[PDB]
Amino acid sequence: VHPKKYGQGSRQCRVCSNKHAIIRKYNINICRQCFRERADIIGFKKYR
Amino acid sequence: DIKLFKKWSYEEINIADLSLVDCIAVSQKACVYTPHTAGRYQKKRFRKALCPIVERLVNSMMMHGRNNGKKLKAIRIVAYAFEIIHLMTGENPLQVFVNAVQKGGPREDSTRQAVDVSPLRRVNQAIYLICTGARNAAFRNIKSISECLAEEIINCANESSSSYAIKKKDEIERVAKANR
Amino acid sequence: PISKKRKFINDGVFQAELNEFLARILAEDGYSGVEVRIRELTSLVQKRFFLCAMAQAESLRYKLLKGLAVRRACYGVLRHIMESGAKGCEVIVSGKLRAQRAKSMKFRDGYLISTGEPSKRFVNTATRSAQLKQGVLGIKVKIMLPTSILPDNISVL
Amino acid sequence: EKSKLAKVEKVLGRTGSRGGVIQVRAQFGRFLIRNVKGPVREGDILALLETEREARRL
Amino acid sequence: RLLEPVPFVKTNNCIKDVDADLFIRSYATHLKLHNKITYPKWCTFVKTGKGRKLAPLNEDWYFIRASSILRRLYLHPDIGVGFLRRQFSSKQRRGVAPNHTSLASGKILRSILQQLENLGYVEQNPKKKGRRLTTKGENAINNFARYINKKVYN
Amino acid sequence: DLDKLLDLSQDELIKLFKARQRRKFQRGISKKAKSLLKKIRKSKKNCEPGEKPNPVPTHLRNMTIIPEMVGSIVATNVEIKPEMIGYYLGEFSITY
Amino acid sequence: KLNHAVFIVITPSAIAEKYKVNLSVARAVINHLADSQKLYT
Amino acid sequence: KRVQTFGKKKTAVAVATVTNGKGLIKLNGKNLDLVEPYILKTKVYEPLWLIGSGKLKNLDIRIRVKGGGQTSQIYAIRQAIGKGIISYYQKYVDESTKKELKDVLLRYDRSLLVGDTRRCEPKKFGGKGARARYQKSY
Amino acid sequence: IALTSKNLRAIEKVCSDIMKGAKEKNLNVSGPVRLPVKTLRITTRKSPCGEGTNTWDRFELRIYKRLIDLYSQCEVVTQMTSINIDPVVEVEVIITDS
Amino acid sequence: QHILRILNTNVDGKEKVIIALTAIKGIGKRMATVICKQANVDPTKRAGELTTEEIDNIVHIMSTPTQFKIPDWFLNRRKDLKEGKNIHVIANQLDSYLREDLERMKKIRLHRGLRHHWGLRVRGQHTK
RNA sequence: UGCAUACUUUUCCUCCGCCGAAAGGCGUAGGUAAUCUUUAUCAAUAUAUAUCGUGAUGGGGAUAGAUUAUUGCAAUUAUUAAUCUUGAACGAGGAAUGCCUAGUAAGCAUGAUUCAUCAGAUUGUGCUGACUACGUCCCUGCCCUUUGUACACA
RNA sequence: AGCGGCGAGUACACUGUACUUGCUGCUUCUUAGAGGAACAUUGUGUGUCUAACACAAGGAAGUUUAAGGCAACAACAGGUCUGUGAUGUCCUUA
Ligand SMILES: [Mg+2]
Ligand SMILES: [Mg+2]
Ligand SMILES: [Mg+2]
Ligand SMILES: [Mg+2]
Ligand SMILES: [Zn+2]
């Protein structure tokens, strides 16, 4: 086992465990496609 | 008292074209002390007619990308030019400018055949031409822009084909003649 | 101690997770809910934490799983929706469906507004993917509810 | 070379395949139907050189 | 040069009623006359901040800097070294990569501040934050400003 | 001098070297580096003054050369002179 | 080309034109006479 | 006694407190002698010139400016002055005089009383600016 | 008292209710002050793939923080707070003299 | 002296002193300025009005600046590889040093050296 | 140098005070945020005053050479950063072609996203604030009526 | 969040101005909820004096005021199974 603590492969999507394209702002930690689907339930409404 | 640059009053100025007067308004509400107006001159078709001529000149000067959106600099340059005009070749600089403007418009142009030119358009062309010529003179010379610009203005006033703008105008006229 | 912004996002995430969990669990239910036999569910949540469209969609999926003539089922659903007092409906079923290639099938009844914030408000929408013989059939149900008044109407007395 | 003043009475139609040019009626004080390349309104004065030679209407 | 017909009277009392660059110059001159502040060791071959890629070319730039700092102090309540650095920042052309803003070399500033405190012009306040002006120093500055104003009038 | 350098302490060596190397030293050296060093020492011990000793195949290219490892060959093979010192290992993998 | 020199109605450009000189030298001359753009008589 | 109005150009709100006094006129803590660049100085002084320097010997003015760049700030200041003086006149001095002043201002130009409503339009994706898209090579 | 919430109208209603409660008696209530709505913006690129002229979409979760003051005893304030309320509006009472 | 020679091969014509100085392969601008400061000679003067003594002094300063007050971190060529002193290298000497370094690299068969020999980058750049 | 045990600040924004040319470091301070970073000012174009003076020039900073740091288990095929030096192409760009109509073009920066570290990207935000239309179907692309078709994979 | 209110001073003016520590009516600016405001309103042209347009005045604003967001029907054998524990078959499974 090798240091898995700080890098892209360290953490992942909460939802589908994908190491690519994670929204890491506000500790959301959802890969952006998944976020786009669940943006309604999380309370992210498109206004402008 | 109402004034421009706290120096050249433009109560003394004269015109003698009619058409040009109609086009460029240096008037009672188009009085101005320093060119920089934040006016809404392009929200209508003819609102550019209300615009003071100095402002227009400054705008013209402002051109060329790496010098674009540097209004203050342009204003300074124009002031310098005016000063030069006042000093060397002694006359009210505003009058000189007016004369140049009068000179500058190509009265007839070519098209896909020869047609006439509206006064406003002609004025605009003159403004452009004078600035462009000045820029050309400046570029990779030494002289300085303000001096060159002043010289150009004086030439325009004279109506002499040593400067560039005048030459261009003449060429245009010739072309028009050829066409019809 | 956690900041307000951080908190809000976290809460949202939790909500989403809960919803997903419910979906996973309740294939046999008219699910909408989200407000907190069930004992187990409660335990699970504790461990974790320290008329309607969705229901209709679920029903459709169940029917598909059971194995009906599809079109008939859709018609039945539409009828049910009508009975339940809907101003308009729409169902789509795209996927494999009988043939190998393609085949999206619309099923509208009453009028269905699509554009505007009215759409966002006055329609409940739901999407389920019913796994079947050789792939997935793709439900999407869209119901226009009774309005609290539409922006298009100008009712003179 | 000598410019003659023609006050514009009415602006007829915007000609040219590409749309830059206008047809204009102008009084000195005679009716001369001419072309113009740039913004022109009623009352504005043209700078006509070759006066007695007109355009084609639309 | 500066003077002109204005539509009001000017209460020439504090430095905020004085033209900046001229004032700074005057202060520098005064400093030079005094010999009140030194020119350490490294001053004469250092670069004022990452972005400058070149020495000052003013000879008595240090004095000028000091003067500027004084003015800054007067302007603000309590002002650090970091703040000072930020104030004297410029654009750093990274050759081919586009420009970034460049924080000044703080060491020199710090040294200047130290010197001032030794001389009794600035004051590290235990309440609040980093080093403001000391009252005597402020008074002196005001006096200087007044003098400058008088000179201009003359 | 080379011999003198070899003789003197590790701290001194670190001070002498360029800054990256120094930093690395400060940080530590990991478990593998020590092993590598040991291996090198062993090789040296085994050596013949006429022809060089047996190579030591190495997966990793990170190692800074220090007066311990002069005179031997390492890893394809690279001989390690006293002229190299703090210039890393490497010299392994690319074509043309 | 025009390699202007250093060793030997007032503006710098004019000066440059007249005696064939660097404009720093022109500036210097102006200063002497007096004793970022310029105007003098 | 004392009257508070604002100007507004882009973002750049210059709040002009116009009070009874001797006639000084200031910005945050500095005289209008400064402003910043010598060229633009006239855009701040212009309303005063229009109204007359003797009329403002009864009126002290302080101006607090915040936000915006340089030219915009100047414009805001001007606007504040214009609104300010007129507002003062409307309350504590006569109406006829106020009207006269307003007329004078109108004759000179807009922007002194009424505000410039323009503001930076949102940048849109597929580009750097509001309208300016990127680039297609085909 | 700090009222943090996601839904504006609901929050407003809650505020109104609390004001009403206060107006009963004994409460020097400062008026509701709504705070700067620190909007969580996520700009995600639409489309899972890299196909299509890359359209983004600016989501905005706009949190409304609301604030209100009182000079009172704890029990009374607790009582006031009990308007029933629900999971949507997050309440916090501060019972400090300072 | 319009045209001058401070070291092995220069020009140093009509230009203002510092820039003339910068013509040498200690062409630092900043370095030149520092040198001037050390000398104590007016930088507003031109290259042609300088005395020979002054020039000599400048040259001396340029050769081993470490013993002079001018500081350590500054110096062109930091540790000099040959394990010893830190000194500014100047003129054709600098070039020679560079060449030597290159040769050394080549001998080593370090990747960078190899790249240099080839005529490729070294930096880490692409040029695809 | 290893483990075990006990105990408590630090993991992100950095005020500030000292050391450090510089980068950065060490010490501490506030901040789970309209409170502190920091925002009655975090930026650059601006502007003012000096040095240059049209000369591949101090325009230009490629390519290179050698250190001092920081991040990281690990920096060479150089993470980035700084310091010194190296002074290449380029004197406004051919055939082609893109974007744009008012706070817009352009210039200037800057926040955020990625982020252990690293913007020349994207995405927001502002600051300096032009020119020219105010139309037309000439091209290009869509749409429409008519018309013709042996095409319908159009 | 400010503005003042006012104590306390430090500098200088005239017979108030600039700057900090300590205490606590107004809401113009600062925040942000609910309301209002433009509808081509009044004026004059052009128009089947129809739908409507152009100009002028008023006005914060006269190109639905500016900008977005939303996005019908039907597709494309467009992209994505390298976003997914959405997912079929075939392959691979020490
Ligand atoms: Mg609709
Ligand atoms: Mg990218
Ligand atoms: Mg095209
Ligand atoms: Mg067929
Ligand atoms: Zn995922």
Side-chain angles (χ1 to χ4, degrees), chain A, chain B, chain C, chain D residues 1-52 54-58, chain E, chain F, chain G, chain H, chain I, chain J residues 1-124 126-128:
Chain A
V1 163
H2 159 88
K4 318 184 179 164
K5 285 155 191 169
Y6 269 101
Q8 188 172 29
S10 68
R11 88 278 143 199
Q12 54 188 251
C13 181
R14 278 164 140 156
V15 197
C16 326
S17 79
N18 318 133
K19 303 161 191 175
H20 272 278
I22 329 94
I23 296 161
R24 212 257 220 75
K25 200 183 191 203
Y26 314 118
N27 311 311
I28 297 159
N29 288 303
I30 305 169
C31 67
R32 88 292 203 285
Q33 26 269 322
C34 305
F35 177 83
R36 227 205 76 79
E37 295 156 40
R38 286 96 188 173
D40 181 41
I41 305 159
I42 298 160
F44 277 103
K45 273 66 178 170
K46 302 156 281 145
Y47 311 126
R48 193 171 63 78
Chain B
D1 180 43
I2 310 162
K3 206 82 187 195
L4 163 140
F5 273 110
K6 318 102 78 69
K7 279 189 170 188
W8 339 123
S9 69
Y10 56 47
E11 188 63 34
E12 189 55 38
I13 62 154
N14 52 104
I15 18 167
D17 203 300
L18 291 162
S19 186
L20 272 54
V21 180
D22 278 28
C23 149
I24 42 160
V26 47
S27 316
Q28 307 98 62
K29 77 96 75 274
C31 294
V32 64
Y33 278 66
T34 307
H36 190 40
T37 316
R40 212 63 50 84
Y41 302 128
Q42 303 298 332
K43 264 199 182 295
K44 269 288 111 68
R45 186 171 145 74
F46 253 62
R47 207 158 279 231
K48 55 171 56 261
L50 299 180
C51 182
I53 201 179
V54 298
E55 170 76 320
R56 220 151 186 167
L57 203 192
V58 308
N59 283 312
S60 195
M61 193 74 274
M62 204 202 303
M63 301 266 81
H64 264 259
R66 132 270 179 176
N67 311 315
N68 217 320
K70 294 181 181 57
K71 166 71 78 168
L72 288 153
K73 189 153 290 114
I75 287 163
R76 201 187 66 246
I77 288 159
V78 311
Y80 260 92
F82 288 141
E83 200 64 37
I84 285 169
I85 299 314
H86 195 66
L87 289 192
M88 314 188 194
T89 319
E91 188 59 48
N92 189 2
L94 252 286
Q95 283 184 28
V96 183
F97 189 36
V98 169
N99 284 334
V101 109
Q102 253 107 56
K103 154 268 143 189
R107 290 180 280 260
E108 295 189 325
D109 295 340
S110 283
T111 350
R112 92 308 91 197
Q113 192 251 69
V115 295
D116 302 298
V117 185
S118 51
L120 191 70
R121 207 267 177 155
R122 102 182 242 188
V123 151
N124 291 10
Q125 282 297 89
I127 290 283
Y128 169 70
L129 260 43
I130 191 82
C131 268
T132 41
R135 252 187 294 283
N136 295 321
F139 196 83
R140 219 210 330 290
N141 183 2
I142 269 286
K143 215 96 294 86
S144 70
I145 181 57
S146 183
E147 167 52 31
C148 276
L149 209 192
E151 174 263 308
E152 296 287 299
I153 288 279
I154 69 167
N155 288 13
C156 280
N158 203 298
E159 213 153 53
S160 302
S161 189
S162 312
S163 48
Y164 144 102
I166 319 206
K167 134 96 286 182
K168 188 155 285 198
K169 173 216 167 180
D170 291 346
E171 188 159 15
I172 291 157
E173 285 186 332
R174 150 278 222 72
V175 107
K177 197 72 187 156
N179 270 222
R180 219 285 295 179
Chain C
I2 26 70
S3 78
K4 288 170 189 102
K5 298 159 88 181
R6 280 165 68 193
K7 159 150 275 172
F8 266 56
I9 267 73
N10 211 337
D11 292 7
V13 109
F14 149 92
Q15 268 256 10
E17 192 166 38
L18 194 153
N19 154 250
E20 283 202 49
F21 179 43
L22 273 269
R24 290 293 174 285
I25 298 287
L26 301 169
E28 76 197 323
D29 205 297
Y31 169 52
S32 289
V34 295
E35 286 302 324
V36 177
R37 197 264 163 284
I38 203 173
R39 168 80 133 69
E40 68 189 30
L41 287 173
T42 310
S43 298
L44 291 150
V45 304
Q46 283 230 324
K47 298 308 184 303
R48 190 264 275 96
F49 167 80
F50 270 92
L51 217 57
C52 265
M54 287 164 65
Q56 290 302 325
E58 199 83 289
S59 314
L60 313 205
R61 101 93 62 73
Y62 225 61
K63 272 179 278 291
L64 293 214
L65 288 170
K66 282 176 186 171
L68 267 70
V70 181
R71 292 279 303 177
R72 177 63 174 184
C74 286
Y75 274 116
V77 166
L78 288 160
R79 200 179 72 180
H80 188 230
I81 291 154
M82 277 35 264
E83 97 81 42
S84 76
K87 184 148 64 277
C89 162
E90 177 186 317
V91 170
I92 95 191
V93 187
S94 62
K96 293 266 286 213
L97 203 43
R98 283 61 170 282
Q100 283 266 37
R101 158 175 156 73
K103 194 169 163 277
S104 183
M105 306 207 298
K106 246 61 157 60
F107 303 86
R108 275 173 284 267
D109 272 32
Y111 81 84
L112 200 300
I113 195 179
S114 54
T115 307
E117 231 269 78
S119 178
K120 290 175 80 88
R121 287 202 209 81
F122 307 129
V123 324
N124 269 132
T125 316
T127 312
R128 299 286 135 73
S129 183
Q131 73 187 132
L132 221 77
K133 320 312 178 182
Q134 297 288 331
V136 276
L137 283 294
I139 288 77
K140 183 152 193 172
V141 66
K142 211 180 275 74
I143 317 297
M144 182 154 190
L145 287 78
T147 194
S148 55
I149 322 176
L150 302 183
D152 306 59
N153 300 327
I154 301 163
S155 301
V156 176
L157 314 189
Chain D
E1 314 203 75
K2 265 283 159 186
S3 55
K4 304 211 174 191
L5 302 177
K7 294 201 174 165
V8 170
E9 292 171 292
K10 274 197 180 169
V11 189
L12 304 173
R14 293 188 53 84
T15 57
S17 56
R18 319 181 95 204
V21 194
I22 334 163
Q23 247 69 331
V24 180
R25 212 204 314 163
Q27 247 194 332
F28 288 79
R30 197 72 79 80
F31 278 35
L32 268 293
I33 293 166
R34 311 226 66 200
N35 290 17
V36 177
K37 184 176 162 188
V40 115
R41 276 196 184 184
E42 299 168 27
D44 286 59
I45 324 189
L46 307 180
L48 311 189
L49 294 177
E50 308 168 57
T51 53
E52 298 172 341
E54 290 180 308
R56 309 132 204 174
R57 300 187 200 182
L58 295 81
Chain E
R1 213 294 310 282
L2 185 140
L3 50 262
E4 49 171 29
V6 291
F8 52 85
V9 185
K10 340 164 188 169
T11 56
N12 296 332
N13 44 34
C14 277
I15 71 175
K16 295 195 180 194
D17 312 61
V18 183
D19 198 64
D21 198 27
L22 335 182
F23 146 81
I24 283 164
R25 303 329 305 285
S26 203
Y27 217 82
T29 313
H30 196 64
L31 256 57
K32 291 279 278 184
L33 172 272
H34 233 91
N35 305 63
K36 62 170 69 260
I37 200 168
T38 338
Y39 203 82
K41 334 164 186 293
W42 30 253
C43 296
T44 195
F45 43 77
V46 289
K47 184 169 63 170
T48 212
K50 335 187 212 194
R52 281 74 181 171
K53 29 108 286 156
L54 219 302
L57 316 181
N58 182 219
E59 197 72 53
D60 62 326
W61 63 265
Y62 195 84
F63 298 87
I64 266 73
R65 247 278 211 277
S67 181
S68 318
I69 262 62
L70 260 42
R71 142 153 261 279
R72 300 340 289 187
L73 296 216
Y74 184 83
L75 286 189
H76 263 115
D78 277 42
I79 306 84
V81 186
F83 181 95
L84 250 344
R85 140 200 262 97
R86 283 203 305 259
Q87 220 284 260
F88 295 97
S89 173
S90 75
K91 51 156 43 163
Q92 169 183 53
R93 55 171 31 70
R94 302 164 140 190
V96 81
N99 299 43
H100 269 236
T101 306
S102 192
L103 300 176
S105 299
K107 167 84 177 280
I108 73 186
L109 277 305
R110 199 197 303 113
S111 82
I112 294 155
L113 271 31
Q114 298 265 21
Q115 256 163 117
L116 269 300
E117 54 184 5
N118 198 247
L119 202 59
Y121 281 80
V122 311
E123 170 187 308
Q124 295 222 126
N125 205 48
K127 181 184 263 63
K128 215 294 195 299
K129 219 65 258 153
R131 42 184 51 139
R132 68 151 156 283
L133 278 187
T134 211
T135 189
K136 207 145 283 147
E138 295 168 26
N139 289 13
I141 266 65
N142 293 8
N143 291 138
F144 212 72
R146 201 103 17 66
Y147 194 97
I148 293 153
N149 287 130
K150 194 125 287 179
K151 199 198 295 299
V152 315
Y153 269 53
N154 291 315
Chain F
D1 211 333
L2 184 279
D3 191 45
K4 184 260 190 179
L5 258 57
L6 172 54
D7 198 59
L8 53 73
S9 308
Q10 219 284 305
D11 159 58
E12 292 273 27
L13 254 335
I14 86 161
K15 95 160 62 177
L16 185 71
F17 286 130
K18 59 189 170 182
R20 156 127 296 287
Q21 281 73 351
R22 215 150 111 194
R23 202 197 148 288
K24 177 212 204 84
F25 284 125
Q26 236 144 303
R27 199 144 179 97
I29 214 80
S30 82
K31 290 180 164 187
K32 122 274 147 150
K34 292 144 53 52
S35 196
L36 193 64
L37 258 58
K38 184 259 282 158
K39 287 179 91 176
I40 261 62
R41 281 200 204 80
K42 204 181 85 172
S43 190
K44 281 204 80 193
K45 153 262 173 175
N46 189 40
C47 84
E48 195 191 328
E51 195 173 316
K52 274 63 71 79
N54 58 336
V56 43
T58 311
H59 306 116
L60 44 283
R61 318 202 294 156
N62 301 306
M63 198 75 265
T64 309
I65 285 63
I66 193 177
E68 287 184 52
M69 321 200 276
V70 176
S72 303
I73 53 166
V74 58
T76 68
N77 70 328
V78 171
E79 192 264 302
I80 17 187
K81 289 282 265 87
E83 185 263 302
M84 296 189 186
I85 52 154
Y87 255 100
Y88 273 78
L89 201 66
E91 315 176 29
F92 207 80
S93 276
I94 194 170
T95 315
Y96 198 92
Chain G
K1 264 229 169 193
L2 215 183
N3 194 307
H4 298 276
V6 180
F7 250 114
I8 307 130
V9 202
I10 305 157
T11 38
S13 62
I15 289 157
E17 280 192 49
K18 280 190 179 177
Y19 297 77
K20 262 62 182 169
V21 219
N22 289 54
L23 277 82
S24 50
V25 182
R27 283 146 53 202
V29 168
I30 289 160
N31 291 8
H32 275 221
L33 286 162
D35 289 323
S36 12
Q37 257 253 296
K38 313 299 175 192
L39 276 171
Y40 285 101
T41 48
Chain H
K1 186 177 170 196
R2 167 264 207 170
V3 180
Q4 302 190 331
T5 51
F6 54 76
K8 221 157 194 177
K9 161 54 155 49
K10 215 162 279 183
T11 319
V13 190
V15 185
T17 73
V18 186
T19 58
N20 272 320
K22 289 155 187 165
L24 302 177
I25 314 172
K26 275 167 174 151
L27 279 163
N28 288 304
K30 301 170 186 173
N31 272 301
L32 290 191
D33 295 301
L34 316 192
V35 184
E36 163 59 31
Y38 185 78
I39 295 154
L40 265 169
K41 282 187 173 186
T42 50
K43 297 294 130 181
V44 177
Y45 299 145
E46 224 53 67
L48 316 194
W49 288 0
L50 281 157
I51 297 159
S53 56
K55 292 289 196 80
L56 302 162
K57 288 162 191 170
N58 306 2
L59 310 182
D60 265 38
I61 313 184
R62 298 190 198 178
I63 308 179
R64 297 227 186 191
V65 200
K66 183 192 170 184
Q70 231 183 240
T71 67
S72 67
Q73 262 199 342
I74 266 157
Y75 268 62
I77 291 154
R78 129 193 284 252
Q79 196 159 306
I81 286 170
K83 273 173 63 172
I85 294 162
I86 275 52
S87 66
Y88 196 99
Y89 272 50
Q90 94 95 21
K91 290 174 192 173
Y92 299 85
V93 204
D94 298 30
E95 282 193 321
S96 56
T97 53
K98 162 207 78 80
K99 289 157 196 159
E100 138 70 355
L101 292 194
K102 279 184 187 176
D103 290 11
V104 167
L105 293 197
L106 286 172
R107 279 173 277 167
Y108 189 63
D109 65 348
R110 271 286 202 81
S111 87
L112 295 154
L113 299 168
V114 175
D116 298 42
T117 58
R118 297 177 290 185
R119 208 158 260 92
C120 281
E121 297 176 317
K123 98 140 199 81
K124 313 305 200 310
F125 58 76
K128 304 220 173 197
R131 312 286 160 70
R133 302 275 65 74
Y134 288 133
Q135 195 158 300
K136 311 196 294 171
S137 47
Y138 311 133
Chain I
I1 316 181
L3 286 292
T4 49
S5 318
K6 188 165 59 156
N7 213 131
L8 146 61
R9 284 163 178 174
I11 236 294
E12 208 72 6
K13 280 198 81 183
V14 169
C15 98
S16 193
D17 288 318
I18 65 167
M19 276 249 270
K20 114 76 50 51
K23 106 177 281 81
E24 292 293 308
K25 251 169 191 294
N26 210 234
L27 270 306
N28 295 358
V29 277
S30 308
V33 256
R34 289 157 250 87
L35 277 284
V37 296
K38 55 190 184 280
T39 61
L40 296 340
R41 69 193 60 194
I42 306 297
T43 54
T44 295
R45 193 188 164 287
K46 293 164 144 191
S47 344
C49 45
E51 213 270 4
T53 340
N54 46 218
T55 57
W56 294 72
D57 51 355
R58 305 151 230 75
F59 297 93
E60 282 213 329
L61 172 29
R62 41 170 52 263
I63 72 179
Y64 307 102
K65 184 169 181 296
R66 252 218 54 258
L67 197 72
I68 186 168
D69 174 46
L70 38 55
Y71 188 106
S72 187
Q73 211 84 250
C74 291
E75 173 50 43
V76 174
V77 304
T78 61
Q79 109 93 33
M80 295 280 171
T81 312
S82 301
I83 307 287
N84 207 241
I85 211 33
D86 69 315
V88 137
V89 171
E90 281 175 12
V91 194
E92 197 222 48
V93 188
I94 315 92
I95 59 263
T96 55
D97 294 46
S98 296
Chain J
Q1 295 175 21
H2 295 88
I3 303 303
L4 183 144
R5 184 145 292 176
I6 184 156
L7 261 156
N8 50 342
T9 73
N10 335 121
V11 257
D12 315 335
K14 205 159 277 170
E15 202 80 329
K16 211 155 104 274
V17 283
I18 302 304
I19 304 309
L21 276 20
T22 67
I24 316 308
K25 308 226 294 181
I27 294 169
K29 299 174 212 184
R30 190 137 106 75
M31 179 67 194
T33 317
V34 324
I35 289 157
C36 207
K37 218 75 209 79
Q38 286 295 339
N40 205 341
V41 59
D42 182 34
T44 319
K45 190 163 69 279
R46 302 298 190 113
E49 205 168 308
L50 293 167
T51 325
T52 51
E53 284 202 322
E54 220 158 39
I55 292 159
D56 188 31
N57 184 30
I58 292 280
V59 169
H60 171 255
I61 262 165
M62 284 209 282
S63 299
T64 175
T66 323
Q67 70 89 14
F68 233 80
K69 196 196 171 188
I70 196 270
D72 188 54
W73 47 260
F74 212 113
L75 301 177
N76 187 189
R77 288 242 40 189
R78 296 97 155 215
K79 312 309 296 296
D80 299 53
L81 279 171
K82 190 286 301 298
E83 287 135 44
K85 302 295 188 181
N86 314 335
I87 45 270
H88 208 298
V89 61
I90 306 290
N92 302 4
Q93 295 137 231
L94 170 138
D95 205 339
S96 202
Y97 263 73
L98 161 146
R99 191 190 170 284
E100 110 192 337
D101 278 28
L102 290 164
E103 298 334 298
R104 234 94 70 77
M105 300 333 294
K106 188 68 263 284
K107 199 208 288 276
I108 292 161
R109 201 162 291 285
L110 194 59
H111 177 239
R112 176 242 283 287
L114 202 64
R115 278 220 173 286
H116 216 296
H117 195 250
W118 259 311
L120 298 165
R121 206 102 281 181
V122 170
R123 148 192 271 257
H126 297 207
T127 322
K128 174 181 166 171

